[PDB]
Design a protein around this motif. Structure first.
Motif, PDB file in Angstrom:
ATOM      1  N   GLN A   1       0.838  -1.191   0.000  1.00  0.00           N
ATOM      2  CA  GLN A   1       0.000   0.000   0.000  1.00  0.00           C
ATOM      3  C   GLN A   1       0.876   1.246   0.000  1.00  0.00           C
ATOM      4  OE1 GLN A   1      -3.587  -0.087   0.082  1.00  0.00           O
ATOM      5  NE2 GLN A   1      -3.392   2.089  -0.434  1.00  0.00           N
ATOM      6  N   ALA A   2       0.503   2.224  -0.829  1.00  0.00           N
ATOM      7  CA  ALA A   2       1.299   3.443  -0.937  1.00  0.00           C
ATOM      8  C   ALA A   2       1.370   4.177   0.396  1.00  0.00           C
ATOM      9  CB  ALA A   2       0.717   4.353  -2.019  1.00  0.00           C
ATOM     10  N   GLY A   3       0.250   4.245   1.118  1.00  0.00           N
ATOM     11  CA  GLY A   3       0.232   4.930   2.398  1.00  0.00           C
ATOM     12  C   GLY A   3       1.186   4.347   3.419  1.00  0.00           C
ATOM     13  N   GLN A   4       1.459   3.044   3.344  1.00  0.00           N
ATOM     14  CA  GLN A   4       2.364   2.399   4.287  1.00  0.00           C
ATOM     15  C   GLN A   4       3.798   2.899   4.173  1.00  0.00           C
ATOM     16  OE1 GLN A   4       1.641   0.522   6.741  1.00  0.00           O
ATOM     17  NE2 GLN A   4      -0.479  -0.094   6.331  1.00  0.00           N
ATOM     18  N   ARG A   5       4.144   3.593   3.090  1.00  0.00           N
ATOM     19  CA  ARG A   5       5.450   4.204   2.861  1.00  0.00           C
ATOM     20  C   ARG A   5       6.536   3.169   2.590  1.00  0.00           C
ATOM     21  NH1 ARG A   5       9.713   6.069   1.640  1.00  0.00           N
ATOM     22  NH2 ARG A   5      10.368   8.245   1.920  1.00  0.00           N
ATOM     23  N   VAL A   6       6.201   1.874   2.547  1.00  0.00           N
ATOM     24  CA  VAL A   6       7.207   0.839   2.315  1.00  0.00           C
ATOM     25  C   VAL A   6       7.642   0.758   0.862  1.00  0.00           C
ATOM     26  CG1 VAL A   6       6.296  -0.517   4.229  1.00  0.00           C
ATOM     27  CG2 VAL A   6       5.519  -0.989   1.892  1.00  0.00           C
ATOM     28  N   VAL A   7       7.126   1.627  -0.005  1.00  0.00           N
ATOM     29  CA  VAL A   7       7.525   1.647  -1.408  1.00  0.00           C
ATOM     30  C   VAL A   7       8.826   2.427  -1.536  1.00  0.00           C
ATOM     31  CG1 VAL A   7       6.720   1.996  -3.765  1.00  0.00           C
ATOM     32  CG2 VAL A   7       5.060   1.700  -1.912  1.00  0.00           C
ATOM     33  N   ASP A   8       9.956   1.722  -1.452  1.00  0.00           N
ATOM     34  CA  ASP A   8      11.254   2.380  -1.541  1.00  0.00           C
ATOM     35  C   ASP A   8      11.557   2.865  -2.953  1.00  0.00           C
ATOM     36  OD1 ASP A   8      11.956   2.004   1.203  1.00  0.00           O
ATOM     37  OD2 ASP A   8      12.444  -0.090   0.759  1.00  0.00           O
ATOM     38  N   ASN A   9      11.232   2.066  -3.969  1.00  0.00           N
ATOM     39  CA  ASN A   9      11.517   2.392  -5.365  1.00  0.00           C
ATOM     40  C   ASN A   9      10.201   2.450  -6.130  1.00  0.00           C
ATOM     41  OD1 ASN A   9      14.760   1.794  -5.456  1.00  0.00           O
ATOM     42  ND2 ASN A   9      13.662   0.329  -4.156  1.00  0.00           N
ATOM     43  N   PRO A  10       9.656   3.649  -6.362  1.00  0.00           N
ATOM     44  CA  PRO A  10       8.388   3.729  -7.107  1.00  0.00           C
ATOM     45  C   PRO A  10       8.484   3.177  -8.517  1.00  0.00           C
ATOM     46  CG  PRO A  10       9.365   5.908  -6.840  1.00  0.00           C
ATOM     47  CD  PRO A  10      10.149   4.981  -5.969  1.00  0.00           C
ATOM     48  N   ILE A  11       9.685   3.143  -9.099  1.00  0.00           N
ATOM     49  CA  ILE A  11       9.845   2.585 -10.439  1.00  0.00           C
ATOM     50  C   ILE A  11       9.447   1.115 -10.451  1.00  0.00           C
ATOM     51  CG2 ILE A  11      12.275   2.020 -10.064  1.00  0.00           C
ATOM     52  CD1 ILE A  11      12.688   2.821 -13.065  1.00  0.00           C
ATOM     53  N   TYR A  12       9.824   0.373  -9.407  1.00  0.00           N
ATOM     54  CA  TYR A  12       9.461  -1.039  -9.337  1.00  0.00           C
ATOM     55  C   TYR A  12       7.951  -1.215  -9.238  1.00  0.00           C
ATOM     56  CZ  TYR A  12      14.425  -2.044  -8.516  1.00  0.00           C
ATOM     57  OH  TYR A  12      15.792  -2.155  -8.632  1.00  0.00           O
ATOM     58  N   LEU A  13       7.282  -0.378  -8.443  1.00  0.00           N
ATOM     59  CA  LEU A  13       5.829  -0.467  -8.341  1.00  0.00           C
ATOM     60  C   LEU A  13       5.168  -0.140  -9.674  1.00  0.00           C
ATOM     61  CD1 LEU A  13       3.671   0.722  -5.373  1.00  0.00           C
ATOM     62  CD2 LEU A  13       2.900   1.009  -7.734  1.00  0.00           C
ATOM     63  N   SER A  14       5.678   0.875 -10.377  1.00  0.00           N
ATOM     64  CA  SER A  14       5.131   1.207 -11.688  1.00  0.00           C
ATOM     65  C   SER A  14       5.323   0.056 -12.668  1.00  0.00           C
ATOM     66  CB  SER A  14       5.786   2.481 -12.222  1.00  0.00           C
ATOM     67  OG  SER A  14       7.194   2.340 -12.289  1.00  0.00           O
ATOM     68  N   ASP A  15       6.496  -0.582 -12.640  1.00  0.00           N
ATOM     69  CA  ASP A  15       6.735  -1.728 -13.511  1.00  0.00           C
ATOM     70  C   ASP A  15       5.789  -2.875 -13.179  1.00  0.00           C
ATOM     71  OD1 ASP A  15       8.726  -0.455 -14.938  1.00  0.00           O
ATOM     72  OD2 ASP A  15      10.358  -1.253 -13.705  1.00  0.00           O
ATOM     73  N   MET A  16       5.583  -3.142 -11.887  1.00  0.00           N
ATOM     74  CA  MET A  16       4.669  -4.207 -11.489  1.00  0.00           C
ATOM     75  C   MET A  16       3.250  -3.911 -11.958  1.00  0.00           C
ATOM     76  SD  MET A  16       5.619  -6.112  -8.012  1.00  0.00           S
ATOM     77  CE  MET A  16       5.206  -7.817  -7.649  1.00  0.00           C
ATOM     78  N   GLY A  17       2.807  -2.662 -11.810  1.00  0.00           N
ATOM     79  CA  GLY A  17       1.484  -2.299 -12.290  1.00  0.00           C
ATOM     80  C   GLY A  17       1.354  -2.444 -13.794  1.00  0.00           C
ATOM     81  N   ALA A  18       2.361  -1.978 -14.537  1.00  0.00           N
ATOM     82  CA  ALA A  18       2.343  -2.130 -15.987  1.00  0.00           C
ATOM     83  C   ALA A  18       2.507  -3.587 -16.398  1.00  0.00           C
ATOM     84  CB  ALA A  18       3.441  -1.275 -16.618  1.00  0.00           C
TER      85      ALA A  18
END
Lengths: 31, 62
Positions: B42-59
């Motif tokens: 979850q974005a609110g949890q702040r545990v997203v260290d690398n937003p690029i990885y989350l964007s890649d996972m979403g794509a």
């Protein structure tokens, strides 16, 4: 006279219900 | 591995909300995988260290 809870990025707005899920287990002892 | 970014990380993260909302719409209207993973990260949890990885996972779901 209690220890401080781990918020862990779980804001609680006034008069708003929220869910807190901390990965730690020690807090279960306090519970 | 180039990760250049702007100093003011105030309004750049706004697009992340739209991206995650789009992902939610896709999964709800087009259920392809289990939705537990989205809850785990979850974005609110702040545990997203690398937003690029989350964007890649979403794509990657595309």
């Amino acid at each position: 006279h209690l220890p401080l809870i781990a918020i862990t990025r779980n804001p609680v707005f006034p008069r708003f219900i929220k869910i807190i899920e901390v990965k730690n287990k020690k807090l279960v002892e306090l519970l | 591995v180039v990760h250049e970014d702007f100093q003011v990380t105030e309004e750049v993260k706004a697009l992340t909300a739209e991206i995650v909302k789009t992902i939610r719409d896709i999964i709800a209207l087009n259920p392809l995988y289990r939705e537990s993973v989205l809850q785990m990260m979850q974005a609110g949890q702040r545990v997203v260290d690398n937003p690029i990885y989350l964007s890649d996972m979403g794509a990657a779901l595309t």
